[PDB]
Amino acid sequence: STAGKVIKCKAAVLWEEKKPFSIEEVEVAPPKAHEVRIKMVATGICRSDDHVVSGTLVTPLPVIAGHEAAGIVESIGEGVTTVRPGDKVIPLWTPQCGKCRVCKHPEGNFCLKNDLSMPRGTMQDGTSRFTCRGKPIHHFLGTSTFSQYTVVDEISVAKIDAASPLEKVCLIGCGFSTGYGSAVKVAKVTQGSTCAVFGLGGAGLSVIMGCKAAGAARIIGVDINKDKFAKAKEVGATECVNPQDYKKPIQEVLTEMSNGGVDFSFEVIGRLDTMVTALSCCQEAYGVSVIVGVPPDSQNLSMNPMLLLSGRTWKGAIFGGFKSKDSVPKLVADFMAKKFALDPLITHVLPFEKINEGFDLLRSGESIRTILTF
Amino acid sequence: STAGKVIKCKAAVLWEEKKPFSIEEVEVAPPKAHEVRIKMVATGICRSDDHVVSGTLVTPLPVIAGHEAAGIVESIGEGVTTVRPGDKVIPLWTPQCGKCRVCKHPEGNFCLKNDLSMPRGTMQDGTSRFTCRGKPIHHFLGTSTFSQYTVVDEISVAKIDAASPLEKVCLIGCGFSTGYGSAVKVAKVTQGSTCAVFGLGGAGLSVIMGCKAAGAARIIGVDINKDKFAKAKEVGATECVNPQDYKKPIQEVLTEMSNGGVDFSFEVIGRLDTMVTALSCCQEAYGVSVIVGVPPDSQNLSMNPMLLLSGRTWKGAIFGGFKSKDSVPKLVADFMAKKFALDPLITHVLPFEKINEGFDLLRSGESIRTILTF
Ligand SMILES: NC(=O)c1cccc([C@@H]2O[C@H](COP(=O)([O-])OP(=O)(O)OC[C@H]3O[C@@H](n4cnc5c(N)ncnc54)[C@H](O)[C@@H]3O)[C@@H](O)[C@H]2O)[nH+]1
Ligand SMILES: NC(=O)c1cccc([C@@H]2O[C@H](COP(=O)([O-])OP(=O)(O)OC[C@H]3O[C@@H](n4cnc5c(N)ncnc54)[C@H](O)[C@@H]3O)[C@@H](O)[C@H]2O)[nH+]1
Ligand SMILES: [Zn+2]
Ligand SMILES: [Zn+2]
Ligand SMILES: [Zn+2]
Ligand SMILES: [Zn+2]
């Protein structure tokens, strides 16, 4: 009843930066060869989507943002083998074409066929499957999840568990996996180690969950906001430290506490000042500090190279270093296996109509993860 | 004829920074429990020794510098089990007490019982085995090789091959191993990879030799001095690139050449500007850049964290990441196995008396490695 035809649905359209979203009547052109048109069931609200509004993350406007979401596959274009309609799936904003240097590398995940480095806000072919009143509307990271219907290439889609609670597994599209992966895939936390996590947002609680999956025995959560200590502890942190409690710098107190600097340090804030500090507090002779995320408008951080000479690794990553297509199904299955839980992060669920409302929550103040439902 | 007694010998004493060395009549007190008094056969001249003179590397003055050298063990104090006199050995400026976090870690090498972080210029006990005309003379990195006789703790000494040509294996005490290790132990170059080396000094040629031992198929040597291209090529670089030849920045041209950035980038110069560039030119999604060495007077390098988000590892290290005591013997054996050669680096051998003369060569202009002989 929809397959093969242009669907007219509602979606949050950003006509211009620094403007609220407009729930628009949009047309979602059918999917061509290797495209898959999905039915959004749930999409989360993430800082990255908010960056677009501000201009910080420059990508073509007008646009339908959204990249953390899970839904049901309605139609599949030609050659689509990885999915069949009815499939619970999660759009992947970091692809896995399985053919470039990066996908072929046993480590890298940042697929070359991504639309992050040099945003086009289009599908692979250079075109757009969106139009509002005849006017073409841009795609975001080849996903555009703030729409009741979306069309993503086959490389930007992943089949997940049919029993997946879509109001909760959507987190695995960005937030959870970006954190969890930093600990379990990038930094590669080890049984016994002592981790320190800067920032206790949702991405933070995910890193803490990763460290726990890894076996870290000590997970020190650090945040200038005391109110973030409960979740974190409840989520896994064995102790939290509010930097404004001391008279000395935190890395000093993280070293004293750790007796020589932590094994792995994670920064899930985005400050440049804290970025250096997170490095400065891991073991000088073998500490690994991971920058989980950086503001896309960031500038030059001032840092003394001595920090690295000691033998300190500094790593960055996109999407918790997971190889999206390969990984997402497995992250899901695990959640489905009753390992990690995603609830403590979902602090709000709002009907998709309340999108602009979900953002204010994000923007000003704490709302770990707001899940917008369709 | 010497064992158990205070030896009176000659050594280069630095009475004050920014002063030439004085070949001094010094007394070398016998070795206590766990000390080993060595007979220097050969010691190389390294930038680090020169830093001391300048003040750059702050360590107690007066002092007998030197840390890259190999010789013969004359007497061994109490409990010394790792050596017996007659033993060809190499002092290790980065210890291996085999008891701290670092030695116990399967990776770190920067032994806690080092004298680099907070120089004391003494042996483990806080004392000095040196005196010139009754006045006590400081030790350097617990080695002090610019002396015909020296006393190093057992953790700062390594037994090598009895067939070791000491005029050539001394390189394995700092220079060679610092480079070679950056490629083969820290960055961990892989069969097939494409490496890029900034700076073609001796430490550079050593990194290139490491990459070769690893299997890198492409080893791009970069240096503003055309005259360094022969050795490097001869040593392993498949092609060298002089940055002053182009109109565009080098990392640009290293990426164009490598089609997407090199696999591993090494910086064996010490510039802060080049440090960032070396990072900026390795694969954004999985490139590892290694800072082989940094000036001990360095300042804050300005760098945009975006560089790491892509998935770029940045690592530093001391002594090519080798675990000195465990490693040195094996590096030697390998050389002795006719694998790598150390000759192309030894561009000068000068009688120890000509020490101040060896430095001018180091200081002003190219002299890959000057070996001072006893
Ligand atoms: N928004 C996301 O879902 C998301 C996803 C992936 C990566 C990230 C990275 O995590 C960064 C923050 O977003 P988030 O972690 O999900 O949540 P967030 O932006 O609410 O969390 C940042 C946390 O760090 C805290 N903080 C601020 N300053 C300091 C400081 N000086 N020292 C210690 N703690 C401090 C702050 O209180 C908050 O708890 C984000 O900016 C991005 O760089 N965020
Ligand atoms: N001196 C040593 O034996 C030694 C040992 C271990 C580590 C190191 C590291 O290597 C650093 C240099 O000492 P070395 O490599 O043994 O020899 P070095 O100091 O003679 O070599 C530095 C090389 O880099 C070259 N160079 C300078 N500027 C540039 C630039 N802008 N771009 C490209 N190339 C440039 C320079 O021509 C020289 O060939 C040293 O400062 C230290 O940080 N050095
Ligand atoms: Zn996101
Ligand atoms: Zn790819
Ligand atoms: Zn040296
Ligand atoms: Zn040790």
Swiss-Prot record, chains A, B:
Q: What is the E.C. number? A: 1.1.1.1
| Co-factor note (free text) | Binds 2 Zn(2+) ions per subunit.
Biological process (GO), any one: retinoic acid metabolic process
Name the predominant localization: cytoplasm
Q: Where does NAD(+) bind?
A: 48, 199-204, 223, 228, 292-294, 319, 369
Q: Which PROSITE patterns match?
A: ADH_ZINC
Essential cofactor(s): Zn(2+)
Which residues take part in binding Zn(2+) 1? 46, 48, 67, 174
Instruction: List the CDD domains.
Output: alcohol_DH_class_I_II_IV
Its localization reads: Cytoplasm
Q: Which SUPFAM superfamilies match?
A: GroES-like, NAD(P)-binding Rossmann-fold domains
- What is catalyzed by this enzyme? a primary alcohol + NAD(+) = an aldehyde + NADH + H(+); a secondary alcohol + NAD(+) = a ketone + NADH + H(+)
Mention any Pfam family matching this sequence.
ADH_N
Q: GO terms for CC? A: cytosol
Residues modified to N-acetylserine: 1
What GO MF annotations does this protein's record show? all-trans-retinol dehydrogenase (NAD+) activity; zinc ion binding
Q: Could you say which residues bind Zn(2+) 2 here?
A: 97, 100, 103, 111
**InterPro entries noted in UniProt:** ADH-like_C, ADH-like_N, ADH_Zn_CS, GroES-like_sf, NAD(P)-bd_dom_sf, PKS_ER
Q: Where does an alcohol bind?
A: 48, 67
Going by the UniProt record, its keywords in alphabetical order are: Acetylation, Cytoplasm, Metal-binding, NAD, Oxidoreductase, Zinc
Q: How does it assemble?
A: Dimer of identical or non-identical chains of two types (E and S) coded by 2 separate genes at different loci.
Protein family according to the UniProt entry: Belongs to the zinc-containing alcohol dehydrogenase family. Class-I subfamily.
The entry's protein name is Alcohol dehydrogenase E chain
Source organism per entry reads: Equus caballus
